[PDB]
Amino acid sequence: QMPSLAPMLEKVMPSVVSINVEGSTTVNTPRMPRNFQQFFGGQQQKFMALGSGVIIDADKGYVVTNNHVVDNATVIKVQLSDGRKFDAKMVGKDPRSDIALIQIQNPKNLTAIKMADSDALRVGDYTVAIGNPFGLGETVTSGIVSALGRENFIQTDAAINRGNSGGALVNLNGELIGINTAILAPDGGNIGIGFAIPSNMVKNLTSQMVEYGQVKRGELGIMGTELNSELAKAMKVDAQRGAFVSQVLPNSSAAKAGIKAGDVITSLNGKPISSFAALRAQVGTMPVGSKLTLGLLRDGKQVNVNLELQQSSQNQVDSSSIFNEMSNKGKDQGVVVNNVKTGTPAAQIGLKKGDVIIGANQQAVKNIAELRKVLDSKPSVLALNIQRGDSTIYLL
């Protein structure tokens, strides 16, 4: 009869799930009355998000999805394409790539998609996207590979006018080639065409979340922008062709090793650095503990140093199956906890600002994958062998 994508879609759909997130966040307190002819310029607020995800491990119930959907989640629900409902928990997330991993709680008879090799993609190749555009459900749209970046973001015309960046990008064989994302951050929604992380990168970032707790991406800990910013002018910067250092992050390697706002990096390991962009991307091709010597500019300053795990990708209330923001520290040198909060449920448990945890409630916790591997096997007695540098206490 007539050609159709329905035959492979039937072998694919069981792997695509819907995701309903419920969570809260801090919003500013509304000042009243409200005057709409007056252009001006803390409380938790519940919000609801919804997106798609792809079953990537049928046994473990591992579902890949966008970080812009599950971010700040308190409750994450998943509904299979056959209608069965499950609960899910955060296992990992990485805001850079806008990719996150979750785990269906109590999976039973699941189907996982097969991942194809991103590296074999070519522009005229056919593409099919599957997502939940406006909430009304699971929509599939078709097209082709528009641009192969060459980070290799995949570009495709199988998008959706005014809709939210769905999820799965699949080839004509039903294999996963990329997860569609949203490059319009803290928004969701597209620029006109579609951007996907390639399947090979998805596989890679995803395994890290599993086997470590987070992705090994080191940060230079500087924060800044281009040489056009109001501060590059309001501070008049000499020789403009590089990355403007607006501030050096606290307790960072850039901070520790030496550097101060103003200097404009001009190179990284000999190579020219013409824009924060160039730099932000280059430092992203280097895993923790790496050493990268870069040239700065004040009069003619330059240094060499080693970076540590970034702070963007971190964990929260999913390490201890219970409930309560740690992350990994250097190589397999335990799990270092970061900025504690105000509610202080975890600080209340004797955990400060820089407390490592090499003791797996008794054993070795070189990382959050392991640590969490124990706070899930023996939920009975828990004594966190934490040692924030000196103090080696054992709280419950």
């Binding site: 500013n28 307190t29 509304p30 000042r31 009243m32 009355p33 409200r34 005057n35 709409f36 002819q37 007056q38 252009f39 001006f40 310029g41």
Partner: protein, 346 residues
């Protein structure tokens, strides 16, 4: 800043950048409100008695992305002044009612909003011909008066209108027929007393069923009082209007009674706290609205002056209007707003 002063011509180039943020439950006003203003005032000596001048001021919003530009001309006028006789100027300028109401328009961010721009002869507007006499031929120190005419600003051209068009036409909420007004103020030592009256023909486009407050003419009557000495500033104004006060997007109020009061003190170390109250009470509005508050708020704020070129402020609009059908229909803000500003000026 005076950037030129030579052979009897002077040019002052001035402006400010106000890094400004609003906090409000009302998301239509919430967020970045950064803006800049630029202007010039020039004067040229024609003879020992006669001076010519011009002034221009422009506002450019600093809170938009680069694919748009939101900017406008605040004032643009040229004039002549004769020593001990008077002055005349023509252009976009302030209506003479503002000679009195300006006295309470001294708040850090808010205030001055019982009226608006392009609102008959109440504030800024196009086509003002303004005559002023200061000190009564120099024979009564502190006594000033003004008489002003405004030409029609009608329907837009090139849009298929068959009557009421002017070259610079606009939407009906910002139109006006011919108008005339006057002001008198007297200031002795720290004290001030003043009054103003305006009367403008209303256009046919304004008098349709699509707008409340139909009427032949818009009239305003204003009284004001001021005290400004010993580091204390006090002022109050009361205005009665007829078919002149906008009621949000609905049209105008058949009658409104507007009141504004301010109290301010200047500390030696640079802090200037401010307290104000504004209200606009509309009557016989039509469409079953009857009597309603158009505006009602208490404003508490403070400015810190580092010097004459740098300052910072917080202004808190405590909005006493309640959310009801009327305010919803008119699109009037009923939420509180906190403004925080940091201002460089020259």
């Amino acid at each position: 800043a005076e950037v030129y002063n030579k052979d009897g011509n002077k040019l002052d180039l001035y402006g400010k950048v106000d890094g400004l943020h609003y906090f409000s439950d009302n998301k239509d006003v919430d967020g970045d409100q950064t803006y800049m203003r630029l202007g010039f005032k020039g004067e040229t000596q024609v003879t020992d008695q006669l001076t010519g001048y011009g002034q221009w001021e422009y506002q450019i919003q600093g809170n938009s992305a680069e694919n748009e530009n939101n900017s406008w001309t605040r004032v643009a006028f040229a004039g002549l002044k004769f020593q001990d006789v008077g002055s005349f100027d023509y252009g976009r300028n302030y209506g003479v009612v503002y000679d009195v109401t300006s006295w309470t328009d001294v708040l850090p961010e808010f205030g001055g909003d019982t009226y608006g721009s392009d609102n008959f002869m109440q504030q800024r507007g196009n086509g003002f011909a303004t005559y002023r006499n200061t000190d009564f031929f120099g024979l009564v120190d502190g006594l000033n008066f003004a008489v002003q005419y405004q030409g029609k600003n009608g329907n837009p051209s090139g849009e298929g209108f068959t009557s009421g068009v002017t070259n610079n036409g606009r939407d009906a909420l910002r139109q006006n027929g011919d108008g005339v007004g006057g002001s008198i103020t007297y200031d002795y030592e720290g004290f001030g007393i003043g009054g103003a009256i305006s009367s403008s023909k209303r256009t046919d486009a304004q008098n349709t069923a699509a707008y409340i407050g139909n009427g032949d003419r818009a009239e305003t009557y204003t009284g004001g009082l001021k005290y400004d000495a010993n580091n204390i500033y006090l002022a109050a104004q009361y205005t009665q209007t007829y078919n002149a006060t906008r009621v949000g997007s609905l049209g105008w109020a058949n009658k409104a009674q507007n009141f504004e009061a301010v109290a301010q003190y200047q500390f030696d170390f640079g802090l200037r706290p401010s307290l104000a109250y504004l209200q606009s009470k509309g009557k016989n509005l039509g469409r079953g609205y009857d009597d309603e508050d158009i505006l009602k708020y208490v404003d508490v704020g403070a400015t810190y002056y580092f010097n004459k070129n740098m300052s910072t402020y917080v202004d808190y609009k405590i909005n006493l209007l309640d959310d009801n059908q009327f305010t919803r229909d008119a699109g009037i803000n009923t939420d509180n707003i906190v403004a925080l500003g940091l201002v460089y000026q020259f």
